[PDB]
Scaffold this motif. Structure first.
Motif, PDB file in Angstrom:
ATOM      1  N   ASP A  51       0.858  -1.207   0.000  1.00  8.79           N
ATOM      2  CA  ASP A  51       0.000   0.000   0.000  1.00  8.79           C
ATOM      3  C   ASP A  51       0.884   1.243   0.000  1.00  8.79           C
ATOM      4  O   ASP A  51       1.701   1.411   0.895  1.00  8.79           O
ATOM      5  CB  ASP A  51      -0.878  -0.006   1.254  1.00  8.79           C
ATOM      6  N   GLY A  52       0.699   2.097  -0.996  1.00  6.03           N
ATOM      7  CA  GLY A  52       1.428   3.316  -1.160  1.00  6.03           C
ATOM      8  C   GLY A  52       2.841   3.117  -1.726  1.00  6.03           C
ATOM      9  O   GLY A  52       3.623   4.079  -1.718  1.00  6.03           O
ATOM     10  N   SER A 102      -7.241   4.663  -0.605  1.00  5.25           N
ATOM     11  CA  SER A 102      -7.029   3.223  -0.587  1.00  5.25           C
ATOM     12  C   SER A 102      -8.299   2.442  -0.871  1.00  5.25           C
ATOM     13  O   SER A 102      -8.256   1.267  -1.254  1.00  5.25           O
ATOM     14  CB  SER A 102      -6.338   2.716   0.651  1.00  5.25           C
ATOM     15  N   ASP A 327       2.238   2.293   3.436  1.00  3.31           N
ATOM     16  CA  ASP A 327       1.426   3.514   3.250  1.00  3.31           C
ATOM     17  C   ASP A 327       1.275   4.332   4.510  1.00  3.31           C
ATOM     18  O   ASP A 327       1.365   5.565   4.533  1.00  3.31           O
ATOM     19  CB  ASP A 327       0.021   3.079   2.742  1.00  3.31           C
ATOM     20  N   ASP A 369      -1.473   0.292  -4.660  1.00  2.00           N
ATOM     21  CA  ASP A 369      -2.787   0.855  -4.941  1.00  2.00           C
ATOM     22  C   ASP A 369      -2.686   2.277  -5.475  1.00  2.00           C
ATOM     23  O   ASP A 369      -3.526   2.667  -6.306  1.00  2.00           O
ATOM     24  CB  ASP A 369      -3.714   0.738  -3.762  1.00  2.00           C
ATOM     25  N   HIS A 370      -1.720   3.042  -5.023  1.00  2.00           N
ATOM     26  CA  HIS A 370      -1.506   4.426  -5.498  1.00  2.00           C
ATOM     27  C   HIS A 370      -0.102   4.854  -5.053  1.00  2.00           C
ATOM     28  O   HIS A 370       0.498   4.139  -4.247  1.00  2.00           O
ATOM     29  CB  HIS A 370      -2.527   5.393  -4.836  1.00  2.00           C
ATOM     30  N   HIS A 412      -1.191  10.972  -0.402  1.00  3.07           N
ATOM     31  CA  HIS A 412      -0.997  10.151  -1.591  1.00  3.07           C
ATOM     32  C   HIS A 412      -0.702  11.104  -2.778  1.00  3.07           C
ATOM     33  O   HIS A 412      -0.991  12.305  -2.722  1.00  3.07           O
ATOM     34  CB  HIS A 412      -2.371   9.485  -1.905  1.00  3.07           C
TER      35      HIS A 412
END
Ligand SMILES: [Mg+2]
Ligand SMILES: [Mg+2]
Ligand SMILES: [Zn+2]
Ligand SMILES: [Zn+2]
Ligand SMILES: [Zn+2]
Ligand SMILES: [Zn+2]
Lengths: 449, 449
Positions: A51-52, A102, A327, A369-370, A412
């Motif tokens: 994540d992230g 997210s 993240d 995810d980003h 983000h």
């Protein structure tokens, strides 16, 4: 199978100061690439999420732990690579929202439809769309959901729940926040309730806290979510040995591991980045967390156990693995915590690849995810945000910058980012793709319907 | 005949708010990627560099100009993609320096050796290393060097000049900053003097200003470098019309186009981003630069004419084309300038690909020397640095952020970034590679000893 190769060595070939010493390639790759290409169906899918974890995050993590010319045995070893887009939509307008959260991104890969920030498993109209996990189960495959965050977190929540807001963890918040989903109001229930009904074979992570809540309605009214869970045939484990005790996991006896009240603990500690920290303060060396515990399974451990159990299923399995805390440590401007969670994910990625290499019919996917805030800048940089100088494996200093928020949380960012794969149908991540394509790629590799 | 296919269209395929409408793919990619693998020798190479054009910069420009679900018909159309690393070295220690400047990175792909920030065509011991261009010339191939910057600037200079400092533009600075290179102290000379010696077939860009200095020694002592070029047989051009009129360019009559005194003008105008600019200010819409001109050729025009001229050589050609101003406008915290220069490069990329698909033995590579400052953040972001809200093609707002420097110039960043390619040997860009591998890849693709 020696059939499908994974990059064994993409580290700098020699003396970095010498001609050719920094090369990562030893020769022409055309042939290895052709050999990495197959349209045969996939029996299993293993989806690993940092994540992230954008390119900056990976690079930073590699520089620190492996040195600039180093190489991540898991993360960096996937042969087929591309860049994907993860923009969300504005709920009101249906127009793009450049920077996703997210929940919206996870909904994208889990159901193949774009949504608004905050949504789980629903479109901009608040209508439900089936997740890949639900689809796999329907088809008879074993399904697994593993993360280091609370199980109610956007990331894993996305495969088993459909709510208008990600905050709708349990009954209490739901009645407030997602009335239409409130069990009592006729809804499908809170994330946790939906998680219980989803009944994946294997589900491991944190978030025990919410299972203490009590049902406002339904068969299990008035009793706790944990009681409901035991009452439903779930096998509740709470530590490594108990998890190890585990010999079988299925629809008769699904597994449910709750290793912490909140998020599992981070691997590494360091101080928080500060204003002019690379200038005013000394270079940092990360500290392993003394309280991570021997009684708490690592992500690589949950990963291995998940694979053993789900692999028993003859039809095949779908497995999602999340390295959640990259993240969250990025949001906290904590270089050490962020890096440590990336190194932690690399190990799990190694476990996955080990199995897929042997197995032969496994598509393994590594992505995020980003993108996030963290940037690698020059040592004597004078930045308006939060910075920190670190002592890397190369014995040199690296400076990290978080300059996108004046608030207590770094944001983000919307940059497209790396997606990488190995196995059948992996060519599907090469070039430019969208996050929604991931759903159609997985559904199709498995032959789901 | 597209022997090997290019990605014809990877925009969102339909309505982005509906199931599957945000998909960039229409089916499985296995066969098409198999069709993109060739180990045949390449006759020609076209290396396209977006200075400072990391994944963030490509995304930002895409969102603005084509919409989030749009697609850059050049940039995004290359089917084989990877991520590469571009760290530099500390001169003194020889250890990695995480964030490179333009000179060290260009030196890296141009000679295959890592070096220190500020160096051109030399190693950490200040030894000269032959460049991909000098090598191609030597083998009898035609050589092109195209950029929108001054020709003395790091990127184009790296192919023809070897100096201890990138600042050594002409005699005057060289005497002071690169005494070892100074013609008058028995050196090889200034960047400009060495460019005239290298004698590539086609050289187009800016930097006419330095051509006004006089040599301090040699056969052309006392004359201006422009007079020397004329004496040496170069054909001098300085506007779109004179360039278009050129029918030939070879070692006998080499082309030297100087279209500006400094850098060529940027394509779009817009205000500089400011503190809380996305909050205290209304959205910006970029506008074409009236100074752009019809007498001033575009990068795509320069690209088209060079390919024409260089393609007349039967042995093959090497051409580097630089979209110089992305980085410069990125340092300047000027979104429209930055994006406009990115769209410009895309146009140049299209011509490159059009030719390559036709020709069938051409290798085309698109990448950047390093990452940069720009970040795409949420519209409501309260950031410590400079921001600006932009009205994109989608009819939505996008916010860009620059927060890595308190100084007047925003900083390069160290993240690994996209590298993409089409043609014979294109496979060597997939997965994780180093910037120095690019030298080895091009050498091998052209079969250079
Ligand atoms: Mg998550
Ligand atoms: Mg440049
Ligand atoms: Zn996330
Ligand atoms: Zn986050
Ligand atoms: Zn540069
Ligand atoms: Zn720069």
């Amino acid at each position: 199978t020696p059939e499908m190769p994974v990059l064994e060595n993409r580290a700098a070939q020699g003396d970095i100061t010498a001609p050719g010493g920094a090369r990562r390639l030893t020769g022409d790759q055309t042939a290895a690439l052709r050999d990495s290409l197959s349209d045969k169906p996939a029996k299993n899918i293993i989806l690993l999420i940092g994540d992230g974890m954008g390119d900056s995050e990976i690079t930073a993590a590699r520089n620190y732990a492996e040195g600039a010319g180093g190489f991540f045995k898991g993360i960096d070893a996937l042969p087929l690579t591309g860049q994907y887009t993860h923009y969300a939509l504005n709920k009101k307008t249906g127009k793009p929202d450049y920077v996703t959260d997210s929940a919206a991104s996870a909904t994208a890969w889990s159901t193949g439809v774009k949504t608004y920030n905050g949504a789980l498993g629903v479109d901009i109209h608040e209508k439900d769309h089936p997740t890949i996990l639900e689809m796999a189960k329907a088809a008879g495959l074993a399904t697994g959901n593993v993360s280091t965050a609370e199980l109610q977190d956007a990331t894993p929540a996305a495969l088993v729940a459909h709510v208008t807001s990600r905050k709708c963890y349990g009954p209490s918040a739901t009645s407030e926040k997602c009335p239409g989903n409130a069990l009592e109001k006729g809804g499908k229930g809170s994330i946790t309730e939906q998680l219980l009904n989803a009944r994946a074979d294997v589900t491991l992570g944190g978030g025990a806290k919410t299972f203490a809540e009590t049902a406002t309605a339904g068969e299990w009214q008035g009793k706790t979510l944990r009681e409901q869970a035991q009452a439903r045939g779930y096998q509740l484990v709470s530590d490594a040995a108990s998890l190890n005790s585990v010999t079988e996991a299925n629809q008769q006896k699904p597994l449910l591991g709750l290793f912490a009240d909140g998020n599992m603990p981070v691997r590494w500690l360091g101080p928080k980045a500060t204003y002019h920290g690379n200038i005013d303060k000394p270079a940092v060396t990360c500290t392993p967390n003394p309280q991570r515990n021997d009684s708490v399974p690592t992500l690589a451990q949950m990963t291995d156990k998940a694979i053993e159990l789900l692999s028993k299923n003859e039809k095949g399995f779908f497995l999602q693995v999340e390295g959640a805390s990259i993240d969250k440590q990025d949001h906290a401007a904590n270089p050490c915590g962020q890096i440590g969670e990336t190194v932690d994910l690399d190990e799990a990625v190694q476990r996955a690849l080990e199995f897929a290499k042997k197995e032969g019919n496994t598509l393994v996917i590594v992505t995020a995810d980003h993108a996030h805030a963290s940037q690698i800048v020059a040592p004597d940089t004078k930045a308006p945000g939060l910075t920190q100088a670190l002592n890397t494996k190369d014995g040199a200093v690296m400076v990290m910058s978080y300059g996108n928020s004046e608030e207590d949380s770094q944001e983000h960012t919307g940059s497209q980012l790396r997606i990488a794969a190995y196995g059948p149908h992996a060519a599907n991540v090469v070039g430019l793709t969208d996050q929604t394509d991931l759903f159609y790629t997985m559904k199709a590799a498995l032959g789901l319907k």
